[PDB]
């Protein structure tokens, strides 16, 4: 054993997925006013399987002739949650090397 795949766990992939998720939410907020755009959601378990997709969000309310299915209340909350979890993933993956370096150097 003793390999980076096992030392880092899955925290090496989660940081990437949280970046992709943040990009999609940023797209949804920007495309909220453009008619005909369908809100895109990212399935977390899919990138989990890709580590070891880009779906559509069904609206809770009807459109108003635009056909745009973006709820700005939902997007802000989902962007806040993703950003908080992204920082935790950096903390988890960052400490993997800090412990790894301390084991090797002994100091």
């Amino acid at each position: 054993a003793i390999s980076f795949d096992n030392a880092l766990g899955i925290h090496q992939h989660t940081v990437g997925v949280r970046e992709r998720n943040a990009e999609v939410i940023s797209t949804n907020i920007a495309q909220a006013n453009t008619p005909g755009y369908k809100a895109r959601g990212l399935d977390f378990a899919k990138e989990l399987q890709a580590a070891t997709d880009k779906l559509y969000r069904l609206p809770t309310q009807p459109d108003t002739g635009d056909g745009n299915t973006v709820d700005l209340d939902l997007e802000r909350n989902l962007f806040m949650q993703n950003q908080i979890r992204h920082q935790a993933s950096l903390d988890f993956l960052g400490s993997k090397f800090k412990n790894l370096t301390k084991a090797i150097k002994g100091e």
């Binding site: 369908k38 779906l55 559509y56 069904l58 609206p59 459109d63």
Partner: peptide
């Protein structure tokens, strides 16, 4: 929730008989 196909648009007809 999520789905694998885009949701349909919304219909706002002035007469539901003609859709």
């Amino acid at each position: 929730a999520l789905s694998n196909q885009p949701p349909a648009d919304a219909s706002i007809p002035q007469d539901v008989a003609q859709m």
